[PDB]
């Protein structure tokens, strides 16, 4: 019993972290096989960040300008290339600690763990969701760029995020491991609109199922609703509209609890219209949307 | 910016996890140097747990009855001894992945990370606090016994908790690494009173300082209070009384923000008396007490 915002064990990722330095800028890199991946803005000075011409900036750099250090040992850089907003530094040594891995582009509303790093050294691990507006509400300070987000399935690490930037609003933006930003962001020091965010409806429903499994049941009511009726409410409260694809992924939780998905939607509808009345659900006084249906089943039934 | 319930990177601990099996019972063990540590109830069957005579049960066991497997490789057990509620299985091989470590008994109100494990395999990591009543509000299923709690300071893992039991109320109890339970608990299947819990006042104040550092400031008011006045309020709301030792550990956060500790106590006093009025602080609608003053400074200013 109990329900926590749980991250994947970070060991497999810790073994991949390196420090990358170019000129006077230092950030984190990810060393997998014989390639180190890092944000391309490692080649910028503060003066360059207003509007960097990354192609021109990178032309001034040679392999020997990228200093890559794995703990205390130095990696020899034998090639460099820019792919979208990431640099890929070919090194002469395959990382002996490379886990089985994949690069994936996650969908908005999915979750992942972040290993925050500074100077190539891991500092902490936390779980978060990719917001519907493609920002993440992380915890990152200067020096965290190049930290990565990931999911783990048995022995395979699926890397989905590399941290690049903190927006003026304090939320975070980054790329997949091919250097493509999530969302409309560009790697330059300008104010950039994130756009309207929404609450991840299917995750709130998943977490209400987690609450019932863990014994918090005060919010279950005698009502039901339809997808159309529930979606009128979701619109009013800035929640994502629920689709049959979301109902389908909630099937396992619906079977575990015996609570039909539309009956749980009626409980969520009443919580949205009445609030929590000073009560709590799984130690929260707000409706939580950072647990997917897969996360809930993994945490409530077991997976290692 | 941002503020998350961050755990230490778990890699150093993942390397220590093993599976321990005795008869038909399997749980987790911690392999440090040439010793594996695990809950002594690995020697019990379900019939024994009502009131086990651990001494008599252990006398029936020999070294060859404890099966210890580190991933896929088997460890040879060459000695066994019970210390309080833990077993210590001497093995013929020092764990090559043993990090620098210490065993510490944490104080109530302190925090630590938990690496939840099943069958010696790490499944997730989360941060939590040792409650003032010596329980932890973890997330653990059957098979999680032997999972450990820890803190990391640079390269040293300080192990503070080993998971033993879930109480009928769904909260958790365990021991230090010398097998001494935190709190009044005994390792037997009986209903056991945890006793009145309280909110960790100094951590709530630390988290209000984290909120101000991150830009959530709506709760700052034009008031101040005294320790005596604040403590009348803390009593009414079941918070721990604040002492000068707590004020002293809040000094760094008070200097960082320029907000005198007693002025922050007046903000906490008003939040306790008026509630949050439908507002949030650091994405929470409740007052958070699982961040110590050390945690806040580590997360807001940096430490790897
Ligand atoms: C280094 N950094 C940047 O945003 C730098 C940057 C500025 C502009 C564009 C890009 Cl692509 C990168 C940061 C990242 N995360 C969190 C930060 C907290 C405080 C200070 C800077 C933080
Ligand atoms: C295995 N276990 C025990 O409490 C066993 C036990 C029972 C009685 C006393 C002791 Cl010392 C141990 C558990 C631990 N954590 C969480 C649990 C969730 C569900 C089912 C059991 C869980």
């Amino acid at each position: 019993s109990g329900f926590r915002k749980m991250a994947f064990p970070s060991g497999k990722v810790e073994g991949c972290m390196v420090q990358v330095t170019c000129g006077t800028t230092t950030l984190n890199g990810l060393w997998l096989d014989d390639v180190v991946y890092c944000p391309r803005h490692v080649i910028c000075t503060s003066e360059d960040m207003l509007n960097p011409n990354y192609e021109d900036l990178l032309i001034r750099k040679s392999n020997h300008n990228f200093l890559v250090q794995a703990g205390n040992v130095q990696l020899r850089v034998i090639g460099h290339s820019m792919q979208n907003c990431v640099l890929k530094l070919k090194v002469d040594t395959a990382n002996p600690k490379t886990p089985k891995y994949k690069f994936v582009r996650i969908q908005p509303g999915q979750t992942f763990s972040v290993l925050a790093c500074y100077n190539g050294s891991p500092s902490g691990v936390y779980q978060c969701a990719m917001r519907p507006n493609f920002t993440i509400k992380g915890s990152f300070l200067n020096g965290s760029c190049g930290s990565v987000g990931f999911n783990i399935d048995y022995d395979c690490v699926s890397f989905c995020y590399m941290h690049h930037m903190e927006l003026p609003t304090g939320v975070h933006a980054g790329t997949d491991l091919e250097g493509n930003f999530y969302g409309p962001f560009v790697d330059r020091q300008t104010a950039q609109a994130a756009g309207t965010d929404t609450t991840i409806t299917v995750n709130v429903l998943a977490w209400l199922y987690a609450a019932v499994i863990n014994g918090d049941r005060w919010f279950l009511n005698r009502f039901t609703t339809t997808l159309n009726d529930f979606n009128l409410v979701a619109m009013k409260y800035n929640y994502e509209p629920l689709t049959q694809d979301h109902v389908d992924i909630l099937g396992p939780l619906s079977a575990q609890t015996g609570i039909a998905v539309l009956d749980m939607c009626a409980s969520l509808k009443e919580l949205l219209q009445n609030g929590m009345n000073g009560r709590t659900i799984l130690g929260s006084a707000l409706l939580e949307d950072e647990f997917t249906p897969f996360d809930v089943v993994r945490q409530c039934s077991g997976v290692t």
Side-chain angles (χ1 to χ4, degrees), chain A:
Chain A
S1 184
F3 202 74
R4 286 278 183 181
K5 197 108 63 168
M6 183 179 294
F8 289 97
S10 57
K12 292 171 176 273
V13 180
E14 292 168 49
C16 302
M17 303 308 307
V18 298
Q19 173 187 95
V20 175
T21 293
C22 190
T24 63
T25 306
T26 290
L27 48 56
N28 303 283
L30 187 66
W31 183 18
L32 295 165
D33 302 325
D34 61 353
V35 179
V36 173
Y37 298 82
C38 75
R40 64 177 181 170
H41 70 253
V42 70
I43 73 180
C44 304
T45 62
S46 303
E47 219 182 341
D48 295 318
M49 296 303 303
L50 37 99
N51 195 23
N53 185 312
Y54 285 95
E55 286 82 3
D56 291 351
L57 288 175
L58 187 61
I59 281 164
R60 298 286 140 255
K61 303 301 182 169
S62 295
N63 293 330
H64 72 266
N65 292 135
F66 296 99
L67 299 176
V68 186
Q69 198 179 319
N72 196 241
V73 304
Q74 213 67 26
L75 297 176
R76 186 172 300 273
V77 178
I78 62 170
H80 62 277
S81 59
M82 182 165 58
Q83 169 174 25
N84 303 309
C85 303
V86 297
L87 296 182
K88 293 190 292 188
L89 305 177
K90 189 191 177 172
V91 295
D92 74 357
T93 303
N95 184 353
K97 304 182 183 163
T98 302
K100 283 175 194 174
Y101 74 95
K102 278 182 201 196
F103 286 174
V104 308
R105 187 158 172 94
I106 54 164
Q107 297 294 307
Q110 293 302 121
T111 58
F112 57 95
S113 299
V114 166
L115 179 65
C117 297
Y118 297 88
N119 304 117
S121 292
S123 66
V125 61
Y126 57 86
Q127 184 78 354
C128 66
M130 172 64 63
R131 299 311 311 165
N133 73 359
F134 291 107
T135 63
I136 76 175
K137 294 178 174 174
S139 170
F140 287 119
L141 307 166
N142 181 39
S144 62
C145 300
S147 290
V148 298
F150 60 93
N151 282 279
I152 306 183
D153 172 49
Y154 174 50
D155 61 351
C156 189
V157 182
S158 282
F159 292 108
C160 59
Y161 180 79
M162 175 167 279
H163 187 48
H164 288 238
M165 178 175 68
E166 179 169 281
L167 295 171
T169 57
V171 307
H172 303 106
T175 68
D176 59 25
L177 270 294
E178 296 202 359
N180 297 113
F181 266 92
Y182 284 95
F185 309 109
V186 292
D187 46 357
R188 74 165 131 279
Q189 197 87 269
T190 51
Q192 297 176 40
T196 311
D197 201 24
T198 56
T199 298
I200 310 153
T201 313
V202 68
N203 290 3
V204 178
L205 289 163
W207 167 92
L208 288 177
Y209 277 116
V212 172
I213 288 164
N214 287 272
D216 278 3
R217 314 168 55 104
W218 64 261
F219 55 84
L220 298 179
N221 63 37
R222 306 165 170 274
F223 316 144
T224 196
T225 186
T226 64
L227 273 191
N228 290 145
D229 180 61
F230 177 78
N231 284 336
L232 290 181
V233 185
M235 189 160 294
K236 179 173 184 46
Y237 289 94
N238 198 4
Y239 267 56
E240 280 283 319
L242 200 67
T243 68
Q244 184 65 43
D245 289 337
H246 298 139
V247 173
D248 285 350
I249 65 171
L250 287 166
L253 287 171
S254 184
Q256 175 73 60
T257 62
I259 299 167
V261 177
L262 292 170
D263 289 6
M264 188 67 86
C265 291
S267 282
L268 175 53
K269 169 173 159 192
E270 293 306 308
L271 290 164
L272 287 171
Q273 292 173 345
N274 322 318
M276 321 241 318
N277 224 236
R279 295 189 289 273
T280 62
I281 299 167
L282 293 179
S284 184
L286 294 176
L287 304 170
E288 175 65 60
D289 77 345
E290 301 200 297
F291 295 101
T292 68
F294 194 175
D295 296 339
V296 171
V297 171
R298 184 186 299 119
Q299 182 165 178
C300 290
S301 286
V303 141
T304 54

